[PDB]
Amino acid sequence: MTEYKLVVVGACGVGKSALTIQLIQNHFVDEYDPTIEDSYRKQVVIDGETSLLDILDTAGQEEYSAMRDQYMRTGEGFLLVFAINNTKSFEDIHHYREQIKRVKDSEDVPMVLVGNKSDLPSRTVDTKQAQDLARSYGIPFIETSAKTRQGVDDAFYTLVREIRKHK
Ligand SMILES: Nc1nc2c(ncn2[C@@H]2O[C@H](COP(=O)(O)OP(=O)(O)O)[C@@H](O)[C@H]2O)c(=O)[nH]1
Ligand SMILES: *CCC(=O)N1CC(N2CCN(C(=O)CNc3cc(Cl)c(Cl)cc3O)CC2)C1
Ligand SMILES: [Ca+2]
Ligand SMILES: [Ca+2]
């Protein structure tokens, strides 16, 4: 059985932990300590083939050590998560993608752009802007709500399809 390392990145407060914990444990967390970085292991059937997902929900400071880079370089695919009511988190997507390109030494790294908090009515990032950014990067785009579970499975499944295509 194939195994994949998936990494969830994006600014503080976008919903990285809530997304991950909905996927793994099927409940919505309101307050999860932002320093906790943990990994979860979940067997999933995607397009009729089972894979073991090893999912890292990131934490940390804005700093870049050799050993941190070497750990992040183990990820096989990355979720680039922003929140649809947080423009700064959308602008930050570029930075996260560039770090991952830098550590992976590659521009073709499996990635999915995720626009979270889709339940909220006060959107500041237009859907078209996000679709246009994902088009430019050559990656899929998925809107999610960790609150309602809308799109959660599909975001991680879509990332596994992208790793499968790349391998
Ligand atoms: N309304 C709404 N709030 C969310 C959603 N996802 C996360 N949140 C909330 O946003 C805050 C930050 O979420 P968290 O998962 O801790 O974000 P992280 O800092 O990216 O790990 C928490 O209060 C969450 O309950 C979502 O889809 N909708
Ligand atoms: C509010 C806390 C939170 O949710 N986060 C801070 C923000 N991240 C955490 C992970 N980060 C690092 O570990 C920085 N180092 C790093 C990142 C990346 Cl993407 C790569 Cl490819 C290499 C290295 O060394 C960044 C900020 C999320
Ligand atoms: Ca978190
Ligand atoms: Ca591509």
Per-residue DSSP letter, 13: T
Q: Which of 7, 82, 96, 117 to mutate to test the pocket of ligand 1 (most atoms within 8 A of CB)?
A: 117
Q: Which two tokens stand for residue 119?
A: 């339940």
Query: Is the distance from CB of 108 to CB of 166 less than 8 angstroms?
Result: yes
What are the extents of the domains in the chain? 1-167
What is the residue whose two structure tokens read 């292991």?
41
CA of 9 to the centre of ligand 3 (A): 9
- Report how far residue 98's alpha carbon sits from residue 32's, in angstroms, rounded to the nearest whole number: 27
**Which tokens hold the place of 51?**
């894979």
| Cβ neighbours for 19, distance < 8 A, ≥ 6 positions apart | 8, 79, 81, 114, 116, 144, 146, 152, 155
Q: Strand pairing of 2-9 and 141-143? A: unpaired
**Structure solved using which method?**
X-ray
Structure tokens at 153: 């499975």
**CA gap 146, 130 in Å, rounded:** 18
- Alpha carbon 80 to its chain centroid, in Å, reads 4
Burial 63-78 (b: 16+ CB within 10 A, else e): eeeeeeeeebeebbbb
* Resolution (Å) of this entry: 1.3
Any idea which architecture 1-167 has in CATH?
A: 3-Layer(aba) Sandwich (3.40)
H or E element at residue 128: helix 127-137
Q: Are 124 and 85 spatial neighbours (Cβ–Cβ below 8 Å)? A: yes
